[PDB]
Ligand binder design. Sequence first.
Ligand SMILES: *[C@@H](Cc1nccs1)C(=O)N1CCN(c2nc(OC[C@@]34CCCN3C[C@H](F)C4)nc3c(F)c(-c4cc(O)cc5ccc(F)c(C#C)c45)ncc23)CC1
Ligand SMILES: Nc1nc2c(ncn2[C@@H]2O[C@H](COP(=O)(O)OP(=O)(O)O)[C@@H](O)[C@H]2O)c(=O)[nH]1
Ligand SMILES: [Mg+2]
Length: 169
Amino acid sequence: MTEYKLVVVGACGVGKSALTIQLIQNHFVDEYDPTIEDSYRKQVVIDGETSLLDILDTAGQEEYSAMRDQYMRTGEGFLLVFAINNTKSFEDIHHYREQIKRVKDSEDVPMVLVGNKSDLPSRTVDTKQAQDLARSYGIPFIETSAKTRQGVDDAFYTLVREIRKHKEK
Ligand SMILES: *[C@@H](Cc1nccs1)C(=O)N1CCN(c2nc(OC[C@@]34CCCN3C[C@H](F)C4)nc3c(F)c(-c4cc(O)cc5ccc(F)c(C#C)c45)ncc23)CC1
Ligand SMILES: Nc1nc2c(ncn2[C@@H]2O[C@H](COP(=O)(O)OP(=O)(O)O)[C@@H](O)[C@H]2O)c(=O)[nH]1
Ligand SMILES: [Mg+2]
């Protein structure tokens, strides 16, 4: 069976855990310990192909050991998550893209920009800004809400389609 290694990255509090649990369980978690970093597996059918998605939900203290670089290097695709009500989380996206570029030693790594918490009215990052950033990186932009499940399957399934496009090159 085909297997895809996906990694969910972004600032603390953006909804990485909430998005992962929404994809895995179809339930919204109000509280998920921000120190818990773990991987989950879900069997899905995407465009007729059965596959196992192994999703690493990053968390815990920010550190950069060589062991952590090697663990991130195993990721085939990354969701760059920011929250639409947190400008600092959007400003931090460049850091996450640079760290992916550094450990993968590549300019062409499958990624999707995800603007989470789209259910909140307290927007501080406009959709146009996020679309321009994703255009500058050559990647898709998807608006999500882990609370209502808006865009959740689209974010993960779009990342799987980007990994498929990369494996074809
Ligand atoms: C919060 C978890 C909490 N623990 C306790 C209380 S809350 C959470 O979800 N986190 C914490 C932050 N993590 C993390 N943070 C960053 O950068 C954060 C910023 C903001 C403070 C200063 N620092 C630099 C920038 F200004 C942004 N970067 C992380 C990071 F890059 C990696 C990591 C590590 C290595 O070795 C390689 C690597 C390669 C690709 C990657 F995508 C990432 C990632 C992510 C890599 N790990 C954690 C980082 C995690 C989330
Ligand atoms: N309204 C709303 N709250 C969310 C959403 N996603 C996450 N949250 C909340 O934001 C907080 C941080 O979410 P969490 O998944 O722990 O973020 P992480 O640190 O990136 O793993 C929690 O209180 C979640 O319930 C979302 O899309 N909408
Ligand atoms: Mg978390």
